[PDB]
Symmetry: D2
Subunit: 193 residues, 4 copies
């Protein structure tokens, strides 16, 4: 009955992906257009997330800087959750909520995109990255789940939320990796048919 | 027809997950038992991977050290692909293939597990981590795809290969995240019902 | 007068290093003996720090795992401030003070050493790493400055504080890198004359 | 006579710092002016290094993004040796020498600075970061030792080499941390007297 639990886990995933295929392609499409437009304008994509969403952010970053599938030029994407010295320096001062906001304020240019990844969309550090990006006239592409959290409360007319239809963090994280992969596909197919 | 590409990408994923649910539960089961046994013996799990597989490794590590879902004690797992100072120091000497093997040799104890994650199973650095782990009398749980690569050539009777049935790296990486999530489920359900 | 400021900065450093050469060799000696003894017993060294002290920790870790100068076997040292996915997962749950304590609890064995590096010795996350290490019957080698902070309040008869005689963080950090280098020297000269 | 070795190590350091105070303030001055000018033009500083030089790079990055001493706005500096997922993805493709060059090509703008840190200045990955930065019309501030290596062979009229007068890597690394600290001092004193 280990085999049963494994079945259940696989099942729940498949059900989630089916529901996401029905609900998300318009949002994915919009996000992809935003990322493509920013990159075409010579802008870059700043990415942030915590935990597994940090891993997903780095996944995006690497797909852009190195490659997704096609040999093509390196594209400008930075994950803000990788420099442990920066992150812990800010935490050491007592500024845990500003770990990504400081980076966005120092590095963001108008026309850049903040790709913000969160399962619940509630963490204060991500909220603040988004609100410093808005300040900087960047557009937001948010990957979320549950009800979208504080994060979805922050998005304006130009911004895009991709809200996985799931109240389960593990499933949400899996859908975020797929979503990022569908985005890299679109981006490469568009910029380098 | 952006919506079509997105459909195709979602489709290919769902097809992969279905085929993995049919083919992998015995292997996942075996891996889970190995990880559980090692942890019960007071041992730890060393994890390594490159690129997105590095992200997947860290995902595992974090699920163990922090939590997967249930509040329970931190469990000992280390990703060997996180200390950038260590990794680049070894690359700076001209030892790129030893970046993980040195770590396994310094840190591994008999009875530990090396969770090795690779889409093709061919990278020399992962091959060598596995072969230093074998030396150290560790057991190997390999997450692979394609035909399993050099990596699958290295596994003995006690070791476990989880070979995603896919010749597509993006799909393989997605299945690796799911597999890790099904493993953390099993591990928690077993050790902390 | 840029050249003057540079002179002043160089001067202050030299003055600090002179004062540290007078005050610290007994402490450095003791620390070195502790690290050597633990390593001889088959134990490992866990390292933590924030910001520049995180960099100094990784410096130690790399000197052990890869090499300091002499080609010799990789030695077991881990910096707990490198896995960004682990660290941010714990911060994402609201447990910022436990980022290193969870790692020490999961990974530490009696007889291991925690090399704790802090300019003031006040950060709650480092305090707690030290107090979980004590629990685990590990010995502490603390690199500190100012008055040693909460950290120096935690050390027992077996533990070692190396307190740089400086109330200036930049100077303290420089002395920490030197101290780590003098330690790697001792360790190699002792274990591999 | 442990106390003697410690004395020797402290001595050699002090001798190095004295010789650097005599030889380097013009170069430090020039570098500081370059970094200040680039930052004034709205540009950013990309930093790279391997091993301990990676740690030194992150130290710089954190001093800029967070703070050096004075509370003041976050300044744009990025270390290219922190995203382990990016770095290992490129190493996984067989492109070890391009790990930083891809990042510089994707991210660099004319007028930016590449702060390149190396004890010998020979590693191919750093050589190539520098030569992609030159392509991108960035200025180079190189922190080196020994004879400056291939790296010093690459610098043009606008670029700055800070060559620590030492043929000893540990001493060189210590002087690099001091140099970075003297630079952050200058930068803050200039931009925010
Ligand atoms: Cl261990
Ligand atoms: Cl930029």
């Amino acid at each position: 009955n280990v085999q049963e639990r494994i079945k259940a886990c696989f099942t729940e995933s498949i059900q989630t992906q089916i529901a996401a295929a029905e609900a998300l392609p318009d949002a994915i499409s919009r996000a992809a257009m935003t990322l493509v437009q920013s990159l075409l304008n010579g802008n870059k994509i700043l990415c942030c997330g915590n935990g597994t969403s940090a891993a997903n952010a780095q996944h995006f970053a690497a797909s852009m800087i190195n490659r997704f599938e096609t040999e093509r030029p390196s594209l400008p994407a930075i994950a803000l959750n990788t420099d442990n010295v920066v992150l812990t320096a800010i935490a050491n001062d007592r500024l845990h909520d500003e770990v990504y906001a400081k980076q966005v304020r120092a590095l963001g240019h108008a026309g850049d995109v903040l790709l913000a990844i969160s399962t619940r969309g509630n963490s204060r550090d991500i909220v603040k990255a988004v609100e410093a990006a808005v300040t900087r006239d960047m557009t937001i592409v948010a990957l979320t789940g549950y009800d979208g959290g504080e994060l979805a409360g922050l998005l304006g007319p130009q911004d895009v939320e991709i809200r996985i239809p799931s109240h389960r963090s593990a499933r949400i994280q899996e859908m975020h990796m797929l979503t990022v992969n569908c985005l890299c596909d679109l981006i490469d197919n568009t910029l380098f048919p």
